[PDB]
Amino acid sequence: SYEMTAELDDLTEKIRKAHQETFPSLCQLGKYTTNSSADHRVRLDLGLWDKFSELATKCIIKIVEFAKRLPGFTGLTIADQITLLKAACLDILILRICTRYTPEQDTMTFSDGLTLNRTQMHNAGFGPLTDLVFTFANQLLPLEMDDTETGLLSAICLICGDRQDLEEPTKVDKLQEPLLEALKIYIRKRRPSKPHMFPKILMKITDLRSISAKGAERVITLKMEIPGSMPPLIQEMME
């Protein structure tokens, strides 16, 4: 009915834990709302942006922690670790916030519980990319991904040997391969009657890439709208 997969069963465990411990799930959070510009869309809600930028900084910190917990990551040169993080940071931010989408109210929840509707997310920073991001969030629902799969998907995104300017690209490739195999097997066990799910889920990375590529442009535009400078950590990741 299923073959023995001890080691991968173990790696999958480490990844799931790393994710859960650096990203609380929707049910674990005490949600709360705000009334700031909940009615109509504006160019940028300074109040919402102030909170958004703080939450983004904190999540980036979490993503770094998540990365350091992936077996082998700290074994790479610091240069490569930075290269990989910078390349995939936005991709992982997008994935994370989209996994906190509540379809009934059309809202997204941050790691402190803050819950905003579509219009508020727009005013907070999403801007012209609002519907694109919300569309992706809706597209995830039918997949019924859990913490393990979300964690594995995040790890595969980050640990990518094709990133430009890598010093030990093949070393990175070797780390990613087990992650791919782990995801395939885990999906196989969870969903026994749907072999097609592996490529389906894996390809959400392609969707993510399309969004983050456009998202990088959105971050540049934000520089012109916000008062003062972009938080320093966000600058380093998007620099």
Partner: peptide, 9 residues
Amino acid sequence: HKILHRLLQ
């Protein structure tokens, strides 16, 4: 990358 470097090390 001062921040990232510190966070990583």
